[PDB]
Write a protein that holds these residues in place. Structure first.
Motif, PDB file in Angstrom:
ATOM      1  N   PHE A   1       0.966  -1.381  -0.141  1.00  0.00           N
ATOM      2  CA  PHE A   1      -0.032   0.127  -0.007  1.00  0.00           C
ATOM      3  C   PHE A   1       0.927   1.155   0.017  1.00  0.00           C
ATOM      4  CE2 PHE A   1       0.348  -1.463   4.119  1.00  0.00           C
ATOM      5  CZ  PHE A   1       0.911  -0.456   5.063  1.00  0.00           C
ATOM      6  N   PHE A   2       0.445   2.397  -0.304  1.00  0.00           N
ATOM      7  CA  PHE A   2       1.140   3.707  -0.238  1.00  0.00           C
ATOM      8  C   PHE A   2       1.121   4.395   1.031  1.00  0.00           C
ATOM      9  CE2 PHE A   2       2.022   8.257  -0.885  1.00  0.00           C
ATOM     10  CZ  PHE A   2       3.330   8.185  -1.274  1.00  0.00           C
ATOM     11  N   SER A   3      -0.086   4.775   1.411  1.00  0.00           N
ATOM     12  CA  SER A   3      -0.136   5.164   2.845  1.00  0.00           C
ATOM     13  C   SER A   3      -1.394   5.064   3.670  1.00  0.00           C
ATOM     14  CB  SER A   3      -0.128   6.979   2.647  1.00  0.00           C
ATOM     15  OG  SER A   3      -1.311   7.196   1.570  1.00  0.00           O
ATOM     16  N   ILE A   4      -1.445   5.119   4.778  1.00  0.00           N
ATOM     17  CA  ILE A   4      -2.637   4.761   5.555  1.00  0.00           C
ATOM     18  C   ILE A   4      -2.915   6.140   6.191  1.00  0.00           C
ATOM     19  CG2 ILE A   4      -3.528   3.584   7.664  1.00  0.00           C
ATOM     20  CD1 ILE A   4      -1.475   1.721   7.591  1.00  0.00           C
ATOM     21  N   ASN A   5      -4.309   6.340   5.916  1.00  0.00           N
ATOM     22  CA  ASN A   5      -4.911   7.794   6.366  1.00  0.00           C
ATOM     23  C   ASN A   5      -5.329   7.878   7.619  1.00  0.00           C
ATOM     24  OD1 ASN A   5      -4.983   8.760   3.510  1.00  0.00           O
ATOM     25  ND2 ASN A   5      -6.748   7.547   2.930  1.00  0.00           N
ATOM     26  N   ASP A   6      -5.771   6.607   8.396  1.00  0.00           N
ATOM     27  CA  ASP A   6      -6.168   6.606   9.598  1.00  0.00           C
ATOM     28  C   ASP A   6      -6.422   5.096   9.951  1.00  0.00           C
ATOM     29  OD1 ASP A   6      -9.184   6.342   9.378  1.00  0.00           O
ATOM     30  OD2 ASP A   6      -8.787   7.960   8.050  1.00  0.00           O
ATOM     31  N   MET A   7      -6.304   4.821  11.248  1.00  0.00           N
ATOM     32  CA  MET A   7      -6.427   3.421  11.764  1.00  0.00           C
ATOM     33  C   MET A   7      -7.106   3.556  13.208  1.00  0.00           C
ATOM     34  SD  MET A   7      -3.059   1.079  10.949  1.00  0.00           S
ATOM     35  CE  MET A   7      -3.938  -0.476  11.467  1.00  0.00           C
TER      36      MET A   7
ATOM     37  N   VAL B   1     -17.283  -7.824  20.032  1.00  0.00           N
ATOM     38  CA  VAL B   1     -16.376  -8.052  19.083  1.00  0.00           C
ATOM     39  C   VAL B   1     -15.664  -6.707  18.694  1.00  0.00           C
ATOM     40  CG1 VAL B   1     -15.838  -8.998  16.566  1.00  0.00           C
ATOM     41  CG2 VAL B   1     -17.734  -9.931  18.114  1.00  0.00           C
ATOM     42  N   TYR B   2     -14.327  -6.483  18.679  1.00  0.00           N
ATOM     43  CA  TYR B   2     -13.729  -5.419  18.420  1.00  0.00           C
ATOM     44  C   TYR B   2     -12.926  -5.440  17.113  1.00  0.00           C
ATOM     45  CZ  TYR B   2     -14.169  -3.369  23.090  1.00  0.00           C
ATOM     46  OH  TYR B   2     -14.778  -2.836  24.370  1.00  0.00           O
ATOM     47  N   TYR B   3     -12.970  -4.452  16.074  1.00  0.00           N
ATOM     48  CA  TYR B   3     -12.836  -4.534  14.924  1.00  0.00           C
ATOM     49  C   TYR B   3     -11.790  -3.531  14.471  1.00  0.00           C
ATOM     50  CZ  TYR B   3     -16.859  -7.426  13.573  1.00  0.00           C
ATOM     51  OH  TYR B   3     -17.520  -8.407  13.815  1.00  0.00           O
ATOM     52  N   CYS B   4     -10.680  -3.699  13.960  1.00  0.00           N
ATOM     53  CA  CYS B   4      -9.525  -2.908  13.439  1.00  0.00           C
ATOM     54  C   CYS B   4     -10.089  -2.499  12.317  1.00  0.00           C
ATOM     55  CB  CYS B   4      -8.131  -3.369  13.156  1.00  0.00           C
ATOM     56  SG  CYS B   4      -6.900  -2.350  12.621  1.00  0.00           S
ATOM     57  N   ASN B   5      -9.976  -1.100  11.938  1.00  0.00           N
ATOM     58  CA  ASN B   5     -10.206  -0.284  10.603  1.00  0.00           C
ATOM     59  C   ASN B   5      -9.162   0.309  10.078  1.00  0.00           C
ATOM     60  OD1 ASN B   5     -11.824   2.267   9.614  1.00  0.00           O
ATOM     61  ND2 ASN B   5     -11.839   0.729   8.330  1.00  0.00           N
ATOM     62  N   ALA B   6      -8.682   0.228   8.772  1.00  0.00           N
ATOM     63  CA  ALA B   6      -7.600   1.073   8.413  1.00  0.00           C
ATOM     64  C   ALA B   6      -8.096   1.692   7.072  1.00  0.00           C
ATOM     65  CB  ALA B   6      -6.605   0.299   7.881  1.00  0.00           C
TER      66      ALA B   6
END
Length: 122
Positions: free
Chosen positions: A28-34, A92-97
């Motif tokens: 990937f190029f860049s992560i905006n937020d997580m 349930v905890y979910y990661c989001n990117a």
């Protein structure tokens, strides 16, 4: 491909503290937020805490004051530290990117992890 790896879930005792981590890997190029969201049965999914690339953050009222979301940008990983656990934190905890896959495009993709169960017992 982009893969989110969630760690730290399971059965924990009320009043304690927990740390969840989420690591993004792949191309990937860049992560905006997580960050982290959660969903309990029969309930709407809700934001817990999110951190942006530049370090701005936002926290749900449920966890403001008893949590910290942090990043290690070099390793595309975020951490949620949460104290004062209560049965209402079971979910349930979910990661989001939110990711830009290519340098030369604005367009972003929203990745959601498999989710990890956190169960707070009294």
């Amino acid at each position: 491909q982009v893969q989110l790896v969630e760690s730290g879930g399971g059965l924990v005792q009320a009043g304690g503290s927990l740390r969840l981590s989420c690591a993004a890997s792949g191309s990937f190029f860049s992560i905006n937020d997580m960050g982290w969201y959660r969903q309990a049965p029969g309930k709407q999914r809700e934001l817990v805490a999110v951190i942006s690339s530049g370090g701005s953050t936002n926290y749900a009222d449920s966890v403001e004051g008893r949590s910290t979301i942090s990043s290690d940008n070099a390793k595309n990983t975020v951490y949620l530290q949460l104290s004062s656990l209560k049965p209402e934190d079971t979910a349930v905890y979910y990661c989001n990117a939110n990711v830009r896959l290519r340098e030369y495009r604005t367009t972003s993709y929203h990745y959601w992890g498999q989710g990890t169960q956190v169960t707070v017992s009294s």
